[PDB]
From a paper:
T(SH)2 participates in crucial thiol-disulfide exchange reactions and serves as electron donor in the reduction of hydrogen peroxide to water catalyzed by the tryparedoxin/[name] couple (TXN/TXNPx). [name] TXNPx (LmTXNPx) is an obligate homodimer whose active site is formed by the N-proximal peroxidatic cysteine (Cp) from one subunit and a C-proximal resolving cysteine from the two-fold symmetry related subunit (Cr′)89. In the first reaction, oxidized TXNPx binds TXN, which reduces the inter-subunit disulfide bridge (Cp–Cr′) and, thereafter, is reduced by T(SH)2. In the second reaction, the Cp thiolate of a TXNPx monomer reduces the hydrogen peroxide to water and is oxidized to sulfenic acid (-SOH); the sulfenic Cp then reacts with the Cr′ of the two-fold symmetry related monomer forming a disulfide bridge.
In this paper, we report the X-ray crystal structure of LmTXNPx in FF conformation at high resolution. The overall structure of LmTXNPx-FF is very similar to that of LmTXNPx-LU. Both quaternary structures are pentamers of dimers assembled to form a toroidal ring with an outer diameter of 120 Å and an internal diameter of about 60 Å. Optimal structure superimposition between LmTXNPx-FF and LmTXNPx-LU highlights that conformational changes occur just in two regions: the 43–53 loop containing Cp (Cys52) and the C-terminal tail (residues 169–199) containing Cr′ (Cys173′). In LmTXNPx-FF Cp is part of the first turn of an α-helix, located in a narrow solvent-accessible pocket that constitutes the active site. Cp is hydrogen bonded to the highly conserved Thr49 and Arg128 residues, both of which are essential for catalysis. The C-terminal tail (residues 169–199), which is missing in LmTXNPx-LU, is completely visible in LmTXNPx-FF, thus revealing the complete active site structure of the protein. Cr′ is part of a loop and its side chain is embedded in a hydrophobic cavity formed by the 170–187 residues. The entrance to this active site cavity is covered by the short C-terminal α-helix (residues 187–195), which protects Cr′ from over-oxidation. Reduced LmTXNPx-FF is ready to exert its catalytic function, i.e., reduction of hydrogen peroxide to water, involving oxidation of Cp to sulphenic acid.
Residue numbers in the entry:
A (entry chain D), G (entry chain D): 3 to 198
B (entry chain C), E (entry chain B), F (entry chain A), H (entry chain C), I (entry chain B), J (entry chain A): 2 to 199
C (entry chain E), D (entry chain E): 2 to 198
């Protein structure tokens, strides 16, 4: 998916971001080594599905932070666009106060590198990436423009990947916190999981 | 994009042998799904761990996809003879048992390459799932690492969101489910119809 | 040349979505201006500092350009949705308010690229302004660094000069303004009519 | 960009023979101006029509540029021998008379090439003018078609604006002139200090 | 030559996961066989028809190889998990049963490619078999189309002819069999010792 | 593949002077054999050691190939003039005597090159033997190192197996000889008719 | 010599020239088919040897015209430069009234094509070319900057080439009008010329 | 420029066999003329028509060149043996007779190519004459078509003009001859010293 | 091959000025000799040493060639004017005198190049000689280094052997001489007719 | 030049198995001959027609070459094993019998290719003979078409001429044989000592 490959280092970047406090700051991906990161792109500030998603992630950021996971949004719009978007009322299609940084991918190269840039329109698809504390890409989700993502699904996936790293077990279809795992071995899988 | 799968381009086509649910072998083409939605999903290896849980999960729920005019198709790099034997193996011994969906045998691995979910060092497909519409256009991409399974309920959610989008000319907000209101993607209308009603 | 923009060559063409003065969205192509003078100006970013003063200044003066068979057209890399919000924001608060000129949304940035005014590392246009004739030929280039705005008066002087040149087959000396005489561009007549006086 | 001339990149360097104000011939290189603002202007041809009025206008005003730590430097594809004769010819007869600025003799035309103002089929420079800072960085581009001269006043406005920007860390709105206030280029301070007033 | 496999050149090297005789997975490399002869043999697909009969034949005959300082190694493009399940299936049901030889799982197909026996259109190996000597040099190539199985007797016949050659510095005539004389590969000695003695 | 010789593709084509059984020289084309099975076998050098014993063995068994609608064709890089002298030479003096098969004179070496069996260092062919069907399609490859002879009986076993295949639409297991059962290559019919009787 | 080769078509050109009457006019080389042409380059208007040569050729143009031969000067300077040069007094280093056209090779491509452009200075060497009525180059003369050409020599050469075309004879070293020719044949050369 | 001869670049160098005036053969190098002026002139063919008139003309006047520190060197594509024979041939029979200058034998034609005066369709040098100064820099180029000879008196004129230029730092006007005044190449000085004195 | 000159290929074609036997200049082309044999022979330089002796030898022997339907043609890189002067020089003074054969003047050297006999470092031809048959095909190549002349007797010997070959469809043994028998180029006829008859 | 064989450059190098006069096989290198003149001659095919008569003629005259410090070396594309059989074959049956010179077995054909004498269509050498001096420098090239034999006497004449050249610093005119005068290659001395006596 662009240069973004599962079990490869997530494409690095360093770019100006609108921060929670309203200020501008260069954020790099490497600066998150040690934590999980949910990087989500959306197409355009001031539009339709985009506000719902950004607000949803920002409002639920604590759910991610409790799990050693940071949240980053990104679009091709400027930091000044982002700022005004947060200064605009949610009832008017605005973001309001934000609890997550938003990158200004003004060169579009970040989205290009994640393979989610629609080149003819110059905007990102709804691509979301789960990156581990080693900097490794683990999960890709990309939606077409008119269909929003699911905060609940992304959290489910984060819990699963964490369960794997902690227990050296694998998570079956539909796993939620507290479901049993399976040992990825012929005999033990049958003994521990399949026979029940 | 993901291999040659780009959102809003035609889904890479293919014609490949599949294990049909009645146990026979049959060539399947992507083009033969025109007029319907298709959920195409890859998995790394027959006779392993998450893989059968996923194949069983979507097979067991296929009537739910088919009610929404959607077909399910599984795929891996294993042969049609391996698939067959997996379906003859009891679920309690890690098998598939009888299936209600086809399973492609991507022996050349080129279906998995064209979808951009092949792990070239090991020869196996990552957990890529692709939602394809009745015009054959790719609409959604899910790709999991090996040890973490997918979610049948999220695939149904996205399916209904896409069908709602195509019916009403509306868009679906974050976390949308069936019976939620959509939004008209116009500046004033979105405000008047959605953002203010919050 | 300035990218693909070369004086006395056709101005690079484009068809691109714009925020129309009435607040709708429409495709504008440069060839739709054939028959009229066009002033095209780029600016780096919506919701910034010198930029709004320039868009406001040209919008507010459009009739002075329309008087002279010249259209005015703004452009930046921002989307048409950003432009819309910027026009719905109060001038006192840093917005444009309602506009009397369209503004291109150069989302792929290829328009600024073709005009040679893209700061690539920033992905934003420098302050480029192009005077284009009824025949779609480029006649004047003006590019400013980011912190210094353009001059509406200067652009109007340039516009009247070009139009005087085309009408009278004469040339306009340094500092020319409307009312001033021109020079006939011939060795003898320039001395008699201009230099000796 | 404009040839190799890109805003906020170093102005393309050159070392080239010039007709010095005293009427001698000397090599001038652009790096010899480091520490000063430089206005470089090209013009098509000695012994023509708009050209002498522009060279005369900038020469005659040089002190106003020198006041502001800015040198002025003219350039055309003509030789230093043509420039010499042009200065020995009477202003009334179409000459420059004595000059207070140097004039480059860009005989290989590579200077105008590097500035992107060469009309190749004619082998002459369009009317390009470049404002370059003390650090040798390009800050402003102005190119006119052949029959329309530049404006000394406008160039001086641009020069004072740039210098104000560097001194005060502020930006200059559209139409700014000396005396006017600037804007602090920050979201809050721009509203309070400028937009609301 | 046969892909990269050239007679009297080092046989294409590899290091790959194998199903071992005890049903574990272990990375095997060809270089670890230096000092012994090796019969490497490919087959198209687990769970098919000629294939089990050859894997079983070479397994059952493994000691006849080991007596002659020769190891045996089977290979298909199938996963090591498919190999396992195949060893768990009854021979009377077309399974392998317990094996006395390792089976490589050439999941990238690059082993079969390096030996020039991949059918690219289907992604499976022809019935290629290679006799490699204690130095790692390829000595013999046998490749059968899919529907025709190989001969274990012939492979042992060749192994012994080669070992005869290496021992006595002589050559083996057509149809040479254990016990038969060879001939000195010299004009005069071939006539006096061999040709004139029929 | 083996140079340009690939299983289930057309055997590389050739047209070359051969020494005919009757002692004459004659151009022979491979395509002139369509309709018939062909066994084409290379040897490195006239007047050597393993070579005559192989040419002689194939020639002396020619009628058993002819009975199975199969021609036999020998080839080396030697001239047709050298081939004739060899047939004029006594078998007891390491000659061929009069032959019952033609011998190609592959003077350019392009035939052997096209079949992947040329040792370029010495400019002679390895012991490559190729089984080509009535359609011109290569079905089997056998390549031996210089010091070890091929097996006439093994070649006959292979022809009979392939002919059996094409006649009955069954496959030939490991070690199959004439009169052994074949197996239907289908999952159930292979178990019913073959595996269950093991 | 550049693209200029003896017995090849002289490199064609069409370029603005200062004419005898003081006007500007595009002149092409083809427009001289039927006449001889002496094309001479010089480096720079307003300089030293250059005036002497241009004046010498212009003053003696009738000598060329009597012989079906036109004269053309060329330099890299503009037509406006040329004009002012003719408006300047000969006593002051000027050309004065001119009886020949002067090309303005402002792109320098004409000199480039005659292989006489000194690229580092962007000016022509003192190259002179004799072209026949068929458009064929017949004679090349190139002087370094500080040494002027000879009008008398060029006329000598023109008379020689004309004698050749008229009589089918060749002109020996140092031939002047009315010197005998030689037939370019072994026997006749000895009989007619060498034996005397 | 003319081949590799450019005015104000070093004259292309060479070392070639020449017929010396005493009738011997000797290698000559351009570099061996350093410190002197050289007039190098090519001619198309020995035993022809204008050619000997030119060679004789410069040989007969060589003392005039040598008084001004200038050497004369002729050249053509003919061999040193042809040159020799031409000098043994009486002038009244079209010969050279004894010469007072060397004649290079440019047998490879590469001297004539490097000077850019070779007529490639016929293999012979055009009438190119080159004036070279004591630093080895090319200062003048004369090139005539075949049927029109050069002028020894013009070559002397140019020679003296160049030597005057180097002595006085002046330039030489159109038609300049010995004893004419030169001009200082400075704006005021040229006027005060020359243009006004006319 | 020898430059472009390959035995049994058309000899490099040319059309060039020659000095004719009557001392005129005429353009000669090789194609104008179709129907006859041609001996083309190169030599390095007019006015030298071995060269006249060979030109004279072939000239004096020209009728022996013409008797056998063979023309003779000499060639050097010298001009046709050098050739003329050489024919005007006395043989007792190392001249040619009157010639009975034409001499090409290969002034571009391209004839000698096409025949692969140019010495590039000196621009002269080695003593190359070519026997071309009535069809324009090259049959024989002889090339001598500069100090060693050719043999006319040997050239005639070869001409006759070739004409014998063409007439009788036989081959000429080593040292074959006019009058000698040839041999039928066939295994049986060569023995019965020739080898067994010494 | 003749492939890579050019006059006055080193004869292309080689190292190849040869059949030695004593009947043994031995690698022979050209460089092993420095110090000696060498005559290297190719023929197309063992067991043919002109070929044996040439090999025999050179072998039977070997001692006359040896006396002039010259070795003789024959070569064909045939194997050393074919060469031996040919020497074991009776001269009256078209054989060579025992030989007094070595015969190279140029099995790769690179020797003949490097000498420019390979007919690529048939893969055999033309009748190329090369005279190589004690420095390894090629001095003479002789190439005949297949049907015409070379001349032993002509080759001896050439050696003697070259040896004469190198001894006395004179050149050998057309038709020169031992005891004929040479000529000093200088204009006057050639006239004085040679031409004047004609
Ligand atoms: Cl836990
Ligand atoms: Cl609905
Ligand atoms: Cl008006
Ligand atoms: Cl101030
Ligand atoms: Cl049967
Ligand atoms: Cl006359
Ligand atoms: Cl003096
Ligand atoms: Cl002696």
């Amino acid at each position: 998916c662009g240069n973004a490959k599962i079990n490869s280092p997530a494409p690095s970047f360093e770019e100006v971001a609108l921060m929670p406090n309203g200020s501008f700051k260069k954020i790099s991906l490497s600066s998150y080594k040690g934590k999980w990161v949910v990087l989500f792109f959306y197409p355009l500030d001031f539009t339709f599905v985009c506000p719902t998603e950004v607000i949803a992630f920002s409002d639920s950021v604590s759910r991610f932070n409790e799990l050693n996971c940071e949240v980053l949004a990104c679009s091709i719009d400027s930091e000044y666009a982002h700022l005004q978007w947060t200064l605009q009322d949610r009832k008017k299609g605005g973001l309001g106060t934000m609890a997550i940084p938003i990158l200004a991918d003004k060169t579009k190269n970040i989205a290009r590198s994640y393979g989610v840039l629609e080149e003819s329109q110059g905007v990102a698809y709804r691509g979301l990436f789960i990156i581990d504390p080693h900097g490794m890409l683990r999960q890709i989700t990309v939606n077409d423009m008119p269909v929003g993502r699911s905060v609940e699904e992304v959290l489910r996936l984060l819990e699963a990947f964490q369960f794997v790293e902690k227990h050296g077990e694998v998570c079956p279809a539909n796993w939620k916190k507290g479901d049993p795992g399976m040992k990825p071995e012929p005999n033990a899988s049958v003994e521990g999981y399949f026979s029940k």
